[PDB]
């Protein structure tokens, strides 16, 4: 009995009227709830009996549902309201949560500032070397970092409360086998805020 | 009206963990209690719920015969036992009270603060903090690389908290080695590299490791 939440990611601005969807693959008899979750915190109940507001929830939140279709509406988005939103059904077991909808603050495209940091000498003295690519303050969040002439891992920040942008730290890590490819190491950065891919390097 | 859960757990694969939830400020036997978990970066999974009055339990089929909920009326407390632990079980576990309008699941009302549970073979280790050195020689970037520590979390501050405006602290990453690494960074004008001396404060309480380290070009 699957609950599909749509869309997964939504971009919006303060004052935007916004609608979020939950489809159930089979009828639930209005046994449906909506939650809000801000990162680091636990969820709050917004809606139960799929149209009824919990005490303490702002009128700008509204919901309706009929059968297999459920919607949550914010009449005007407030800064407090950018968070992730979950649906849950009580119809039968298991009581299931939707996948989520993350609502992010929409801004103008901004290109990342790219940086590359070669390994530390101190890190080298430990017998292991890591090269880092830093993408500072970009938007939107979809971006591509490529290492090669190896296996790497990327990590992204949250959205900045001040600037509403994202940042990315990619780490290419080779100790194992000074890579079977050993000359020049680099990271090509692709983002739609840039003319064409930006590249940074050393040695 | 509050639910206070127990502290963070670290466990080897194949082990078992008991998490507790104590209720305050409302009568315990009046509301069903769900258990819900969230793995990092992922959404909510319902494990099951218990009636603290009757002691009735419904466990989600996926977890049946592995997960168990119990309760103690005396101490107004609910228990969750997860057994035969696996990497898949890493995440935060919440207890949450149902409004239980009409003796039915209606919605989750009061939530616990959550209990972090980590499952790995790995052993407690302090981090290695490495400089991320500034270049040329316009605008530049500085940082720390906090590598191979277990378990989470750590704290990272720049100028020992003095400037929070430029700092970007990236979430850690679980490595193939089974230990965590993150990066911390700051952006500054590039005339400042000769002048100002850059603080780095890192606290990993699990290893009881406090580290201060400085980054210049
Ligand atoms: Zn099904
Ligand atoms: Zn009902
Ligand atoms: Zn920045
Ligand atoms: Zn009784
Ligand atoms: Zn029950």
Tell me how far CA of residue B94 lies from CA of A109, B44, B113, in angstroms.
Answer: 38, 10, 7
Q: Chain A within 8 Å of B16 (Cβ-Cβ)?
A: no
Rounded to 5 degrees, what are φ and ψ at A171? -125, 110
Q: How many CB pairs under 8 A join A and B?
A: 128
Question: Does B139 share its domain with B200?
Answer: yes
Q: How far apart are CA A32 and CA A84, in angstroms?
A: 17
Residue at token pair 């903090």: B129
Question: Does B1 share its domain with B35?
Answer: yes
Burial class (CB in 10 A: 0-12, 13-18, 19+), B211: middle
Question: Does B157 share its domain with B89?
Answer: no
Q: Which residues in chain A have Cβ-Cβ distances shorter than 8 Å to B96?
A: 42
The DSSP secondary structure of A43-81, one letter per residue, reads PEEEEETTTEEPTT--TTEEEEEETTEEEEEESS--GGG
Domain span at B167: 122-217
Number of domains within chain B: 2
Question: Does B99 share its domain with B203?
Answer: no
Residue at token pair 């993150």: B182
Q: Chain A within 8 Å of B147 (Cβ-Cβ)?
A: yes
**Would the CB atoms of B34 and A31 count as touching at under 8 Å?**
no
Residue where a domain terminates, one of B68, B103, B121:
B121
Q: How far apart are CA B160 and CA B148, in angstroms?
A: 22
Question: Does B1 share its domain with B56?
Answer: yes
Question: Does B140 share its domain with B200?
Answer: yes
Give yes or no for a contact between B16 and B81, defined as CB atoms under 8 angstroms apart. Answer: yes
Question: Does B155 share its domain with B182?
Answer: yes
Question: Does B193 share its domain with B128?
Answer: yes
CATH number for B194: 2.60.40.10
Give yes or no for a contact between B184 and B203, defined as CB atoms under 8 angstroms apart. Answer: no
The length of chain A, given as a count of residues: 203
CA A109 to chain centre: 17
Question: Does B39 share its domain with B89?
Answer: yes
Question: What is the signed CA dihedral for B152, A154, A198, A117, rounded to 10 degrees?
Answer: 40
Give yes or no for a contact between A155 and A142, defined as CB atoms under 8 angstroms apart. Answer: no
Resolution (A): 2.7
Rounded to 5 degrees, what are φ and ψ at A147? -105, 125
Contacts of A152 (CB under 8 A, 6+ apart): A145, A170, A171, A172, A173
- What would you report as the CA-atom Rg of chain B, rounded to the nearest whole angstrom? 22
CB atoms within 10 A of CB A108: 8
CB atoms within 10 A of CB B195: 6
Residue where a domain terminates, one of B121, B148, B164:
B121
Burial class (CB in 10 A: 0-12, 13-18, 19+), B83: middle
Give yes or no for a contact between B49 and B94, defined as CB atoms under 8 angstroms apart. Answer: no
Residue where a domain terminates, one of B121, B145, B163:
B121
Residue B53 Cα, ligand 4 centroid: separation in angstroms?
7
Give yes or no for a contact between A108 and A14, defined as CB atoms under 8 angstroms apart. Answer: no
* Of A113, A116, A89, A92, residue with least CA distance to A32: A89
Question: Does B75 share its domain with B93?
Answer: yes
Contacts of A196 (CB under 8 A, 6+ apart): none
**Would the CB atoms of A93 and B147 count as touching at under 8 Å?**
no
Tell me how far CA of residue A80 lies from CA of A34, A36, A84, in angstroms.
Answer: 16, 11, 11
**Would the CB atoms of B111 and A43 count as touching at under 8 Å?**
yes
- The number of helices, as runs of H, and strands, as runs of E, in chain B is 0, 19
**Would the CB atoms of A88 and B46 count as touching at under 8 Å?**
yes
Rounded to 5 degrees, what are φ and ψ at A94? -80, 160
Residue at token pair 């800064």: A79
Q: How far apart are CA B199 and CA A74, in angstroms?
A: 44
Q: Which residues in chain B have Cβ-Cβ distances shorter than 8 Å to A57?
A: none
Question: Does B70 share its domain with B127?
Answer: no
CB atoms within 10 A of CB A168: 24
Domains and CATH numbers, chain A: 1-107 (2.60.40.10), 108-203 (2.60.40.10)
**Tokens encoding A182:** 């050993």
**Tokens encoding A72:** 């949550």
Question: Does B49 share its domain with B81?
Answer: yes
Q: Chain B within 8 Å of A36 (Cβ-Cβ)?
A: no
Give yes or no for a contact between A190 and A157, defined as CB atoms under 8 angstroms apart. Answer: no
């Amino acid at each position: 009995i699957q609950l599909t939440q749509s869309p997964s990611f939504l971009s919006a601005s303060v004052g935007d009227k916004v609608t979020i969807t939950c489809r159930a693959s089979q009828g639930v008899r209005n046994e449906l709830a909506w939650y809000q979750q801000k990162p680091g915190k636990a969820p709050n109940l917004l809606i139960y009996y799929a149209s009824t507001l919990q005490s303490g929830v702002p009128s700008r939140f509204s919901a309706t549902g009929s059968g297999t279709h459920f919607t949550l509406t914010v009449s005007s988005l407030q800064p407090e309201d950018f968070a992730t939103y979950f649906c849950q059904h009580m119809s039968s077991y298991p009581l299931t949560f939707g996948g989520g909808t993350k609502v992010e603050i929409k801004r103008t495209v901004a290109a990342p500032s790219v940086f590359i940091f070669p390994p530390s000498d101190e890190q080298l003295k430990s017998g292991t070397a890591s090269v880092v690519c830093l993408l500072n303050n970009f938007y939107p969040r979809e971006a591509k970092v490529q290492w090669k002439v190896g296996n790497s891992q990327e990590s992204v920040t949250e959205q900045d409360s001040k600037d509403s942008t994202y940042s990315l730290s990619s780490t290419l890590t080779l100790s194992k086998a000074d890579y079977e490819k050993h000359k020049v190491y680099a990271c090509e950065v692709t983002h739609q805020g840039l003319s064409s891919p930006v590249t940074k390097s050393f040695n | 009206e509050v639910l206070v859960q127990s502290g963070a757990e670290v466990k080897k694969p194949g082990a078992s963990v008991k998490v507790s939830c104590r209720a305050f400020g409302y009568t315990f036997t009046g509301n069903a209690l769900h258990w819900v978990r969230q793995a990092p970066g992922q959404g909510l999974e319902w494990l099951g719920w218990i009636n603290p009055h009757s002691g009735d339990t419904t466990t989600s089929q996926k977890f049946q015969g592995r997960v168990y909920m119990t309760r103690d009326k005396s101490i107004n407390t609910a228990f969750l036992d997860v057994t035969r632990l696996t990497s898949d079980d890493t995440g935060i576990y919440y207890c949450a009270r149902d409004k239980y309008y009409g003796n039915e699941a209606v919605g989750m009302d009061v939530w616990g603060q959550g209990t972090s549970v980590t499952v790995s073979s790995a052993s407690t280790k302090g981090p290695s903090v490495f400089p991320l050195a500034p270049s040329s020689k316009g605008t530049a970037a500085l940082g720390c690389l906090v590598k191979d520590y277990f378990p989470e979390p750590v704290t990272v501050s720049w100028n020992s908290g003095a400037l929070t405006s430029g700092v970007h602290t990236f979430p850690a990453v679980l490595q193939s080695s089974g230990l965590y690494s993150l990066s911390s960074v700051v952006t500054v004008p590039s005339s400042s590299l000769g002048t100002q001396t850059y603080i780095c404060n890192v606290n990993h309480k699990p290893s009881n490791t406090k580290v201060d380290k400085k980054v210049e070009p």
